[PDB]
């Protein structure tokens, strides 16, 4: 969770998986993981009394701490990185394409 939130180079390939609709569209899974979430928006405290996270498996712990916990701004954050990646690559060829069409005319 620290490497993913650090926007490190090595996490670029696997962060696209978390932006897919399959991971986000889990209405049943999100409801079950709701009591284990942390209200990081205000206070940063457990919503329920104990709801120990050690009982959760390795993948359940990662999902609730990333998707459920940060669901307020996760989609906006993901949209910020998707646009940046596209501009870093598709902008260079787009300029060439416009120049070629204008030159041909």
């Amino acid at each position: 969770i620290r490497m993913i939130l650090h926007c490190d180079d090595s996490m670029n390939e696997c962060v696209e998986f978390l932006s897919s609709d399959k991971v986000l569209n889990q209405p049943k899974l999100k409801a079950d993981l709701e009591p284990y979430r942390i209200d990081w928006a205000n206070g940063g405290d457990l919503v329920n009394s104990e709801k120990d996270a050690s009982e959760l498996s390795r993948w359940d712990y990662l999902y609730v701490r990333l998707i459920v916990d940060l669901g307020g701004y996760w989609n906006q954050r993901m949209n910020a990185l998707k646009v940046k990646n596209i501009i870093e690559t598709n902008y260079e060829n787009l300029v060439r394409q416009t120049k070629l069409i204008g030159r041909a005319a």
Binding site: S20, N90, Q97
Partner: protein, 370 residues
């Protein structure tokens, strides 16, 4: 731990789940001595399997039990598996489950006999069969893309949008590394070199693995080779003679993109990738274009990734972007993907138990595995 055996047309890789590399990699050949034994001091076994046959390949008739990904001779296949578990892996199959790999669009009898042999000869507690191309995508850490696998018998393009492959868009061609080897020795006679016997076939494969490369522009490179020098490389044969090959360096790999040289009406390896993508949904085409993955030993030529990108770009619309991913260890991508799948905790419920096979016979392999 679960053994992961990836039987291949040319070579078979066996190891353990969770490892980063196969434990044993030996050729999948079974040879028998055509000459008559004259001495009695040594054992002089009836048949030799694996690298043992390669060392003594001069006096043996090497036969491949697998052709085009289909096990033609089941008597020799039992010899190879008996050699894998008891001589290379030196483990008892009766305690560890075994994971196998089968090429897509294969005869139903091919994977039906595999289940029967595993559960009756080696008495493995569990078994599973997985598509070779699907596992190649897992080794790259992806779950959405198109895998261009190419080995000795099969060159299949399997577009995998999700964890499960798309069955209706799978394209399989019977043009692979073994076909190019037969073409290399056909055009090598033009220079005066004659390789005919199966023992001499293994010499040609060494030449192909070391000197052949894919030219970016075939027409331009042919003219360059017409000026002589700067392109001829010298290879040393086990006899001792030195042979030189000129335009044959790039002509043999060019048969992949132009199968008309071999007299096959099938399209090239670049068009068959574009055709496979065109059979998918419009929304999914964007992801498959940018996540093309190569695998297999045939795609290990120097410059095949660069040449493939140019060919697809011309065919594909200019709006889409093409990104060919060529991992450095793509030779063992099929096995590495299988190691990840076997080590998963969720995969423990996908095993075929011994009791399950007994109640339904060999036919259970079609319904459970994919």
């Amino acid at each position: 731990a679960a053994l992961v055996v990836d039987n291949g047309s040319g070579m078979c890789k066996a190891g353990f789940a969770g490892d980063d590399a196969p434990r044993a990699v030996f050729p999948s050949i079974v040879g028998r001595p055509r000459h008559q034994g004259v001495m009695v001091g040594m054992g002089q076994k009836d048949s030799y399997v694996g690298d043992e046959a390669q060392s003594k390949r001069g006096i043996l008739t090497l036969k491949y039990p697998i052709e085009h990904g289909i096990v033609t001779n089941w008597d020799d296949m039992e010899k190879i598996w008996h050699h894998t578990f008891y001589n290379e892996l030196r483990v008892a199959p009766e305690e560890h489950p075994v994971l196998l790999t089968e090429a897509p669009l294969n005869p139903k009898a091919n994977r039906e006999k595999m289940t029967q042999i595993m559960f009756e000869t080696f008495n493995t507690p569990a078994m599973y069969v997985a598509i070779q191309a699907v596992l190649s995508l897992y080794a790259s850490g992806r779950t959405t893309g198109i895998v261009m696998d190419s080995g000795d018998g099969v060159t299949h393009t399997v577009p995998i949008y999700e964890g499960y492959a798309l069955p209706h868009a799978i394209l399989r061609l019977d043009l692979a590394g073994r076909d190019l080897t037969d073409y290399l020795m056909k055009i090598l006679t033009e220079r005066g070199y004659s390789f005919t016997t199966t023992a001499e076939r293994e010499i040609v494969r060494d030449i192909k693995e070391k000197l052949c490369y894919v030219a970016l522009d075939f027409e331009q490179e042919m003219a360059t080779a017409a000026s002589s020098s700067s392109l001829e490389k010298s290879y040393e044969l086990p006899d001792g003679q030195v042979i030189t090959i000129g335009n044959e360096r790039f002509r043999c790999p060019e048969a992949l993109f132009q199968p008309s040289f071999l007299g096959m009406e099938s399209a090239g390896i670049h068009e068959t990738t574009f055709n496979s993508i065109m059979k998918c949904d419009v929304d999914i085409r964007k992801d498959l274009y940018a996540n093309t993955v190569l695998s297999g030993g045939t795609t290990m030529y120097p410059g095949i990734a660069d040449r493939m990108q140019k060919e697809i770009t011309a065919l594909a619309p200019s709006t889409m972007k093409i990104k060919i991913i060529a991992p450095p260890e793509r030779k063992y991508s099929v096995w590495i993907g299988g190691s990840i799948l076997a080590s998963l905790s969720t995969f423990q419920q996908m095993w075929i138990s011994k009791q399950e096979y007994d109640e339904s016979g060999p036919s259970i392999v079609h319904r459970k595995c994919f």
